[PDB]
Amino acid sequence: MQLSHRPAETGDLETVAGFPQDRDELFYCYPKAIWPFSVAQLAAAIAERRGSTVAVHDGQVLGFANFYQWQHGDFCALGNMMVAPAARGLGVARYLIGVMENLAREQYKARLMKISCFNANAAGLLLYTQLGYQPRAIAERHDPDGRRVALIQMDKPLE
C-alpha cells in the first residue's frame, strides 16, 4: 500500500460515487443523500463543503473525504468518508483521516476534529477509537425507513 493524496477533481466523481455499495453504506457516509448515489449529488456536497480530498494508490482513487463543518481556530468535522470496496481494511480511511487532521490544523488552525458515526457502522467506531477519537454524546437520527438510529459524536484534540 503506497498512498498519496490530492484535492478531488471532476474526473474522480464517477469513481467516488461508486464507493457506497447499498443504501446503508450511503446513509452512513452521507445521511442527507438519496439512494442511488450519483455524481450530481456528490458534486453538490463538494460545492457546499471544504477540503474534498482523494487518496490514491497504484494509480487508483481508493478513498474520499471532506469537511462538513469548519470553524477557524476551533474545529472541523469530517464527512463523506468513503473507500473503494476492494480497498477496505487496508488503511485507506486511516491514511485519509491523518491527512484531513493535518489539513484542519493547517487550513483552519483547528484544535479539535469532530467525527460523527452511525451506530451500525462498527468498523468506523472501532477505527476512530484506534485513532484516538473519544465518544462525547449520542444523538437521535432517523434512517431512510424512518427507523430511529444513534449518531455517536466523537472528537479528538489536534495540537
Ligand SMILES: NC(=O)c1ccccc1C(=O)O
Ligand atoms: N453530516 C452528517 O450528518 C454526517 C453524519 C455521519 C456521517 C457522515 C456525515 C456527512 O454527511 O458527511
